[PDB]
Every structure is written in structure tokens, then in C-alpha cells.
Ligand binder design. Structure first.
Ligand SMILES: [Mg+2]
Ligand SMILES: [Mg+2]
Ligand SMILES: [Mg+2]
Ligand SMILES: [Mg+2]
Ligand SMILES: [Mg+2]
Ligand SMILES: [Mg+2]
Ligand SMILES: [Mg+2]
Ligand SMILES: [Mg+2]
Ligand SMILES: [Mg+2]
Ligand SMILES: [Mg+2]
Ligand SMILES: [Mg+2]
Ligand SMILES: [Mg+2]
Ligand SMILES: [Mg+2]
Lengths: 169, 296, 40
RNA sequence: GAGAACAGAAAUCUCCAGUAGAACAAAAGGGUAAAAGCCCCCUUGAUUUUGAUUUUCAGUGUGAAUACAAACCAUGAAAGU
């Protein structure tokens, strides 16, 4: 019984885990920039491993958060690449979902060898309306069980829209 | 509630619940203590806070003093009271907040005796000033602005209510760096802009900014403004007139009887469900043992 | 004829109290696997 | 815990749970959750004057500390600190 329990997309965050800092990262950053239109954010390394050749606070990654119609736009632009085919996995038991795509040129974006080719992790966080209770300052509360996102309920929404796919157990 | 996350008896037992007004994300105690607490060497003089809260599009302005048994309200003025003085729509706007501030200012001043004295500033030019004390006379009433959990941003309606109370006559110690029109880098305030916000220059500018670019959104947004034949030009005067009306009568008279509380109590107890009897649930579980364990 | 006619630095901040430069407790070779997928 | 190209036990991204199981230079013990911890902004009160008080005690000193008085300042919308 839902006249307002209609599943919107909260945000879509794109993430390039460029394993090191430098030119490669400022390039993946410029890609994210002309994929979002918003200045992306850089991520520093938490600790140091040295097998991955990284260092604490190395600024080894970039991401960008996009919400609304623009997010639906890029979401579809990537769904095409993945042929509208996902798996029973890839979905959080909490309702959200995401995929990954190497070959970032499949998103319309041209080649431009002065930047190279890069991969990207796509993560879509979904939520019904009134999710503001958990994110506001005053009276911050928890949404009812029946009202928050579910994994089966989200895959059902995903299939209904774009009829894309489920594909396995 | 994934079974891998359920809480244990030990967790719940050794768990310490916070204060109710905290669990309800309503009171910032770290702030309440420093606002309420009074100098131990005065020992009865209450610290009067000017609580200003914002319901969804309705302003609340109460003047309280704390008591070991519960805060006592001295004066109370709800922005929804503005119709009486001359404002009908959007009683959430900066000008509405300033209106309520001035309202309570004069209301408490009269409830006290400092009505003729401490009339505040009338010709509001949008200047930065505080209600100064009178030579060889009682010091003005002093209250401290309680914005609750509001996020202090430069130019907010909470500070608009502040400007209203101060202009009304209440002594509210305050700075000017968070009043609309404050220049971030250069240390100069724009009183033309502040006066504008006090009257509606931004809402009025929006009205005549949408009136000739998109009548399709002005259609419903501002619908009532048209439903009552009134455009931007007018706004400054509706507010100024409201100012005169409030300064003339701060009286607060309440709502009519309207189906008195005992009647309300009845028509609501109808929906109020009262707990069951222990014997009731005893039999309510005995019936279940018979209907479930008794081989159907 | 008709011959065809870096962004601002924003860095994320971490909310973790930890400030030591050491791997976490899960980052241990023990949890790896013998003959994992290993694309060949 | 469940999720996302390379990515693997360990890189970065997201959500859920999370009474503190963390962090607060250091020894340990207290204490701390819109903080006392983490990110940020503005600062020099780690300042000036001479007294009282607590611990150790002889109710000497020193060390350390507490609460005021008189200044000049910092921060905050503010009460305040
Ligand atoms: Mg409904
Ligand atoms: Mg490497
Ligand atoms: Mg048990
Ligand atoms: Mg506060
Ligand atoms: Mg940190
Ligand atoms: Mg965390
Ligand atoms: Mg310790
Ligand atoms: Mg020193
Ligand atoms: Mg001894
Ligand atoms: Mg002696
Ligand atoms: Mg001696
Ligand atoms: Mg001594
Ligand atoms: Mg001494």
C-alpha cells in the first residue's frame, strides 16, 4: 500500500581507484569532471601497504556524487554498456546496487589520448521519499522497516524499469 | 533487523539511555546549560532566553526562564498571529520573523511596564543598534537569543527575529556579522539591503522578477498574492502598516471557546486506546496455547 | 574547405580517529586462499 | 555485514548496524559522544597586578592546583568559555 512509498535515486557516486597519485590521478579527475560537471573529490590513502606502492595520505583516488536527473542520465549511459544485465549479487541487502566498467569511453566520452583510458565503479544509492529524517539535524530518526529499501524490492524496481535483467540464482 | 545484528540482553542491560529531550533530537544540552545557568551570586534572577523556533512554515517566539520543575514561559508570540496585524501569506519569511520579534518585544515590554519607555526604534532604517539604557532609569529587559539547534549562517531568519526583538525594545546582546547584507571579506554592512530584507525587498524583487519571465511558475507560487490583487510594489507598506498595528496593540488576545477542552478530551479519548488487563492477556495467551499447541 | 571548424582541488576528509600508519586487523595474509581464481 | 572495473587477506566508493568495544603525546587509573574524540575557521589568556585557598605540612618552604578581585585581550549571534 504505497501512495508515497515510491523509490527515487538518492545519489550515484562514480569512483576511480587510480592506484597512485600524480598525472594519472589528475587525469582521472579531469575525466570525472567532464562526466559530472561538478568538481570531483580526491581520496587519500588511509594506511601504507607498499605492495600496492602507496603511502598514507597519498591522494590515490577520486570520486563524484551526482543526484537527480543527471544521475539517471549517467546511470542509463552505463546501463547501456552493461547491456542492461546485472546479477543477483551486486545488490546490497539494504536496497542499493552498483556495477563496474573499464573502457570509460563507452559512455559517449571521446578517447583523447592525452588522458588515456580509465575504469570506474558505479554505485547507485536508492531511497523512498522522506529519507531526510536520517540525514537532517533536528529530530534525526530511523525510517520504518516497511518504508526503507529492500534488496528484492529494489531488483523488482530495477527489472520493471528498463526491463533490463536479473541473470542468475 | 538482520539476525546477524540483533542486540543481546547484555548490550541492552549495560546500555545507558540519554535524556529524553536528546533522544528526541530536540535539546542541545551542552548549549542549554551555558544559556540557562546563572551567576551563583545573584541567586534568583532568572536568565531569560528568547526561544525562537521554526515549525514547517510557522514561527514560534517564546520568552522563558528555567525552573528546577520546568521552564516557565513569560511571554509567547506565534507568527501565525500576524493576520491580526496585517500579513496573510508566507509567515516564514525573514520579514515575518522580524515581525514576530518586534511583536514579542512590545508585548513583554507592556506586560512589564516598560511600554512608554523603551519603545525601541520606530523609523527602522535597517541600522545596527542595541536598545541602550536610559539615563537615571530602569535598565531595559535583557534576554538571550535561543536558536536551539539552528545552524548559524550569515543572514538567516533566526537573526531576523533577533533584529525584530531588538528593534522592538528588548535588550538582546548581538553582533551584526550574521545579518543579511554582511560583506564576507570587507567589514561593512549594507543597511539598505538589511532594510530591504526587513520589509520584503527580496520577495518583492522575486515577484516582479517572475512576473515577466515565467508566469507558469508564478501561477501557483505566489498564487494567493494574485488571488488578493497585490504585487511587489505594495509589500513594503503592508509590513510597515503591520509594524504600526503591533506597536499600537501588543495585546494577544486568545482564540474563542470553540468546543471547550472537556469536549476535546472526549472526542480524542475516543481514539486514545488504554492498556489491557493482566488477566486479559493471561487468557489471550491461554487461548493461543489451546488454538496452536492443541493439535489445531 | 569545411576542415573541422585540472579541476579545483577538493580533498575528502576521514572521520576515523585512528592516526597510526599501520594496516588494520583484517589485512592479514591468513585470509587469502590457496589456488584462487587466478585467470590463466 | 552486505555491496562496486583492474582490486587480490590489505588500496578507493556506498549503505546498514554500532554505549564507545576508539581516540584524547606519554605510565596507569579516572573522565569524555550534537564531546573531551575527527575536519574546519578565527586567535595568543601559555598575557598584566598583588592577595587568599587545597594537597604534601611544622598546618614552614617548594612543586602542582583551585576559586575570586583589578586590567588588557581571544573567540562566538550569544549565554558564555
Ligand atoms: Mg500515503
Ligand atoms: Mg601501484
Ligand atoms: Mg542470553
Ligand atoms: Mg552550540
Ligand atoms: Mg580523521
Ligand atoms: Mg567508518
Ligand atoms: Mg588514559
Ligand atoms: Mg608559560
Ligand atoms: Mg610522606
Ligand atoms: Mg607551623
Ligand atoms: Mg625552609
Ligand atoms: Mg603555600
Ligand atoms: Mg608559591
Amino acid at each position: 500500500q504505497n501512495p508515497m512509498r515510491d523509490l527515487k535515486i538518492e545519489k550515484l557516486v562514480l569512483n576511480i581507484s587510480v592506484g597512485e597519485s600524480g598525472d594519472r590521478l589528475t587525469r582521472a579527475s579531469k575525466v570525472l569532471e567532464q562526466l559530472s560537471g561538478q568538481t570531483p573529490v580526491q581520496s587519500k590513502a588511509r594506511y601504507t601497504v607498499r605492495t600496492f606502492g602507496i603511502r598514507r595520505n597519498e591522494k590515490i583516488a577520486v570520486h563524484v556524487t551526482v543526484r537527480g536527473p543527471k544521475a539517471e542520465e549517467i546511470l542509463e549511459r552505463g546501463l547501456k554498456v552493461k547491456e542492461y544485465q546485472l546479477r543477483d549479487r551486486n545488490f546490497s541487502a539494504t536496497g542499493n546496487f552498483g556495477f563496474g566498467i573499464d573502457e570509460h569511453i563507452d559512455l559517449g566520452i571521446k578517447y583523447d589520448p592525452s588522458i588515456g583510458i580509465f575504469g570506474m565503479d558505479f554505485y547507485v544509492v536508492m531511497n523512498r521519499p522522506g529519507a531526510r529524517v536520517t540525514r537532517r539535524k533536528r529530530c534525526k530518526g530511523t525510517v520504518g522497516n516497511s518504508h526503507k529499501t529492500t534488496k528484492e524490492d529494489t531488483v523488482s524496481w530495477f527489472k520493471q524499469k528498463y526491463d533490463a535483467d536479473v541473470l542468475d540464482k | 533487523a538482520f539476525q546477524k545484528d540483533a542486540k543481546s540482553s547484555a548490550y541492552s542491560s549495560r546500555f545507558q539511555t540519554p535524556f529524553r529531550r536528546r533522544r528526541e533530537g530536540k535539546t542541545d544540552y551542552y548549549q542549554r546549560k551555558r544559556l540557562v545557568t546563572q551567576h551563583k551570586a545573584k541567586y534568583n534572577t532568572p536568565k531569560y532566553r528568547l526561544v525562537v523556533r521554526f515549525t514547517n512554515k510557522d514561527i514560534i517566539c517564546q520568552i522563558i526562564s528555567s525552573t528546577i520543575t520546568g521552564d516557565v514561559v513569560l511571554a509567547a508570540a506565534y507568527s501565525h498571529e500576524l493576520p491580526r496585524y496585517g500579513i496573510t501569506h508566507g509567515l516564514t519569511n525573514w520579514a515575518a520573523a522580524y515581525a514576530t520579534g518586534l511583536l514579542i518585544a512590545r508585548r513583554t515590554l507592556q506586560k512589564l511596564g516598560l511600554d512608554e519607555t523603551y519603545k525601541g526604534v520606530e523609523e527602522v532604517e535597517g541600522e545596527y543598534e542595541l536598545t541602550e539604557a536610559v539615563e537615571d532609569g530602569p535598565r531595559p529587559f535583557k534576554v538571550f537569543l535561543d536558536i536551539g539547534l539552528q545552524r548559524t549562517t550569515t543572514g538567516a531568519r533566526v537573526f531576523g527575529a533577533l533584529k525584530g526583538a531588538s528593534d522592538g525594545g528588548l535588550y538582546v546582546p548581538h553582533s551584526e556579522n550574521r545579518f543579511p547584507g554582511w560583506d564576507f571579506e570587507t567589514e561593512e554592512i549594507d543597511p539598505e539591503l538589511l532594510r530591504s530584507y526587513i520589509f520584503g525587498g527580496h520577495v518583492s524583487q522575486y515577484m516582479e522578477e517572475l512576473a515577466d519571465d515565467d508566469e507558469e511558475r508564478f501561477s501557483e507560487l505566489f498564487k494567493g498574492y494574485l488571488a488578493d490583487d497585490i504585487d511587489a510594489d505594495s509589500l513594503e507598506d503592508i509590513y510597515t502598516s503591520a509594524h504600526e498595528a503591533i506597536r499600537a496593540d501588543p495585546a494577544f488576545k486568545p482564540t474563542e471557546k470553540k468546543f471547550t477542552k472537556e469536549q476535546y478530551a472526549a472526542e480524542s479519548k475516543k481514539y486514545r486506546q488504554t492498556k489491557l488487563s493482566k488477566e486479559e492477556r493471561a487468557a489471550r495467551v491461554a487461548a493461543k496455547i489451546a488454538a496452536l499447541a492443541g493439535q489445531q | 574547405g569545411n576542415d573541422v571548424e585540472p579541476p579545483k582541488e577538493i580533498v575528502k576528509s576521514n572521520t576515523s580517529s585512528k592516526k597510526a600508519d599501520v594496516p588494520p586487523p583484517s589485512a592479514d595474509p591468513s585470509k587469502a586462499r590457496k589456488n584462487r581464481p587466478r585467470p590463466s
